Amino acid sequence: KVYNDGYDDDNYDYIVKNGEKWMDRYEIDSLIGKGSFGQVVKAYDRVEQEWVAIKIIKNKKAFLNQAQIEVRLLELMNKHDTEMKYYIVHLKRHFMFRNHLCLVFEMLSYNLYDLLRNTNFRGVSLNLTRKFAQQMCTALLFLATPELSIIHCDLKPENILLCNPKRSAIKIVDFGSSCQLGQRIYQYIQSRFYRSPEVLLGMPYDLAIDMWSLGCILVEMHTGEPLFSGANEVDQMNKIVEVLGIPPAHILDQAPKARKFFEKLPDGTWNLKKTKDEYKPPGTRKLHNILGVETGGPGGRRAGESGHTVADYLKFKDLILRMLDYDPKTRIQPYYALQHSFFK
């Protein structure tokens, strides 16, 4: 009947109220988002004199413990990064309030899904895509710091925010499903569109799963549509195969989930399993053609615009192919990605 002396609801969320004042400091403005974790509100900080984003965790032990691991990762990042220059959202502080853990972040503008929607899902230019690619590669190089070794584990357009609507700066949010490198505890990770082959196949994985995600993300920013839009795991693998061909035999030989997607013929080679109810043959949906390297960009809409020549498109195509390498050991790393001709 009553949850937390009337402050909470049945679903463990704080009942957010316009104009409420917390601790004689934070003036609550409005609800901006909700997740499984809880809620996120926009608020004004009267001591520091600036707008902030407050992540209000649910009043329940399972989410409280999850949030504590996030708080550990951000304070570890803040320790190494004092100058605030590696493109991760800054955690200013955290506090307990009416039995809720609250995390105080810097206020940024909208996310990259919202930008895609504002283009009518037609995508942004190659000049802006280059600038997002550079900052994201720099961000992944920071997470690959040996003392950190952080895997975000859920990179998508929703978790990339623009700092200011009228500038090109971006930041990565939401380390709630993140972890430091180690022994495998989880197999069902990453959002399906952005999920690596090694995860689909049930194999060992490391920080390279974020680089696969980034490759998928950068094509989507320019074309406006998801590169691999699986409705289930079997659809996801089939769309990956359409573009990149059948995975190498020596990986499928080790993969415990290979037979969910493929089948091993008498000759020792792997073939796709049939479906109930229309795919192009392996590797015939070329990225060259998806990007429109010789036909003026996605949908022919970039023909005549500067920074969209055939030479510029081949630099982008090449970089993206190295990010979508099947083998996580040879897939390009943040340091080397920054040295590509696309950023030169």
Ligand SMILES: NS(=O)(=O)c1ccc(-c2cnc3[nH]cc(-c4cccnc4)c3c2)cc1
């Ligand atoms: N207009 S909107 O699409 O509803 C929206 C929602 C939240 C945010 C926003 C602004 N600043 C933020 N700082 C930290 C976050 C954030 C993001 C994801 C998970 N937890 C906090 C965060 C989110 C911006 C725009």
